[PDB]
Amino acid sequence: MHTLYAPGGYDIMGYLIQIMNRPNPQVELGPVDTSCALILCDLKQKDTPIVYASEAFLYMTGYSNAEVLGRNCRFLQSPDGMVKPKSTRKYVDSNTINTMRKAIDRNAEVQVEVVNFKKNGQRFVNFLTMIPVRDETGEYRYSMGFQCET
Amino acid sequence: MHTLYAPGGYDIMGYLIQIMNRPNPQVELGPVDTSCALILCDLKQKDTPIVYASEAFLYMTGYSNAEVLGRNCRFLQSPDGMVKPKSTRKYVDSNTINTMRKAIDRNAEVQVEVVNFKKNGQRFVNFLTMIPVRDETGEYRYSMGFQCE
Numbered sequence: 001m002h003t004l005y006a007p008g009g010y011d012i013m014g015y016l017i018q019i020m021n022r023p024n025p026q027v028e029l030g031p032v033d034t035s036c037a038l039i040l041c042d043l044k045q046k047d048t049p050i051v052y053a054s055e056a057f058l059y060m061t062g063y064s065n066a067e068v069l070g071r072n073c074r075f076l077q078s079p080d081g082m083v084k085p086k087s088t089r090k091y092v093d094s095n096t097i098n099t100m101r102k103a104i105d106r107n108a109e110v111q112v113e114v115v116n117f118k119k120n121g122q123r124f125v126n127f128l129t130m131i132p133v134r135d136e137t138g139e140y141r142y143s144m145g146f147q148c149e150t
Numbered sequence: 151m152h153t154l155y156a157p158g159g160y161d162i163m164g165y166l167i168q169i170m171n172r173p174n175p176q177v178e179l180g181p182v183d184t185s186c187a188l189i190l191c192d193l194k195q196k197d198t199p200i201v202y203a204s205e206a207f208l209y210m211t212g213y214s215n216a217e218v219l220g221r222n223c224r225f226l227q228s229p230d231g232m233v234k235p236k237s238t239r240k241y242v243d244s245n246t247i248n249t250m251r252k253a254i255d256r257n258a259e260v261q262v263e264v265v266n267f268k269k270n271g272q273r274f275v276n277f278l279t280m281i282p283v284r285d286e287t288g289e290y291r292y293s294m295g296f297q298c299e
């Protein structure tokens with residue numbers, strides 16, 4: 001992967017405001033800000049890479065900024081952070097992973113519980129929410145994920 | 151990360167987020183953003199002057215940025231834009247004007263319906279809501295107002 005990052009960063013705050021103000025929410029999130037564990041992935045770049053991760057996300061997973069950026073979030077699904085696309089995970093529910101995948105392909109809001117692993121190998125249940133986000137052009141370009149341990 | 155600062159070094163999006171995530175809301179505002187008529191006033195400057203006004207506010211009141219910045223928002227209480235402090239308004243409920251006043255001194259959220267006039271003198275009912283806001287120090291430094299016709 002050779003993910004590129006938007007020079008000048010991302011309008012995280014503008015996207016959080018966009019999400020809280022969306023007209024027909026399929027999932028209720030309640031108020032949110034940059035304090036939770038969250039990430040933004042680029043839907044238009046190869047294998048939907050992470051182009052931003054809040055500090056709470058790094059704190060929750062144990063990985064640093066350098067270790068997460070430019071990677072598809074699926075690496076958390078393995079205690080060794082090694083998960084090849086299309087692979088049959090041995091520690092994660094296949095239907096769960098397929099649900100996330102179809103929701104993303106369709107720009108449809110989804111919410112699931114997925115088994116994840118921290119950098120030190122510690123297993124936990126991630127209560128994950130993904131919401132598609134429109135950029136300045138008005139079309140879906142990114143996806144915002146909200147991660148919660150338990 | 152891209153923090154868009156609005157023309158003074160003001161983090162308007164940051165405060166909108168702060169306001170929507172406040173722990174003890176005394177008034178439901180529902181989601182809000184910069185596409186609505188809002189303004190920011192500096193509580194630590196003489197007579198709580200407007201330091202920021204969105205384009206929607208300027209459109210709704212007919213006044214321009216040069217005509218509103220640095221002024222107390224009470225000028226809308228008169229069809230000529232002239233209102234001296236402490237004065238007994240002749241077109242605005244005295245009780246309402248006092249409610250806003252005390253709420254602001256106490257940094258307490260408030261929502262009211264006040265009579266206002268656009269720059270051209272057109273009278274309209276403003277459904278105003280004011281919420282105190284904390285700056286980087288964690289203490290109330292500004293107040294954001296949400297105006298609705």
Ligand SMILES: Cc1cc2nc3c(=O)[nH]c(=O)nc-3n(C[C@H](O)[C@H](O)[C@H](O)COP(=O)(O)OP(=O)(O)OC[C@H]3O[C@@H](n4cnc5c(N)ncnc54)[C@H](O)[C@@H]3O)c2cc1C
Pocket residue numbers: 039040041048072073074076077084085086087088089094095097098100101104114115116126128130143144145146147
């Ligand atoms: C903003 C954002 C944040 C994210 N945050 C996280 C996070 O914190 N943690 C996390 O674990 N993931 C996270 N993800 C998810 C991750 O990036 C992948 O999207 C997810 O693993 C699903 O896509 P995939 O590419 O891995 O699918 P694939 O690798 O293709 O895997 C799909 C699996 O489903 C099975 N499958 C496929 N079709 C069917 C079918 N018809 N019936 C039954 N089984 C089927 C397959 O056998 C396969 O093993 C996030 C995604 C986004 C966009």
Ligand SMILES: Cc1cc2nc3c(=O)[nH]c(=O)nc-3n(C[C@H](O)[C@H](O)[C@H](O)COP(=O)(O)OP(=O)(O)OC[C@H]3O[C@@H](n4cnc5c(N)ncnc54)[C@H](O)[C@@H]3O)c2cc1C
Pocket residue numbers: 189190191198222223224226227234235236237238239244245247248250251254264265266276278280293294295296297
């Ligand atoms: C962010 C923000 C946004 C705002 N947006 C608007 C807006 O869109 N429109 C608008 O009109 N205002 C707006 N305001 C309010 C305005 O700027 C003033 O705060 C408001 O008019 C009250 O303060 P004052 O200084 O005018 O009070 P004063 O000049 O002191 O007037 C209060 C009035 O109440 C009467 N009064 C006082 N005490 C009593 C009493 N005990 N019993 C009976 N009567 C009494 C007085 O006789 C007087 O006429 C906004 C304020 C903020 C902070």
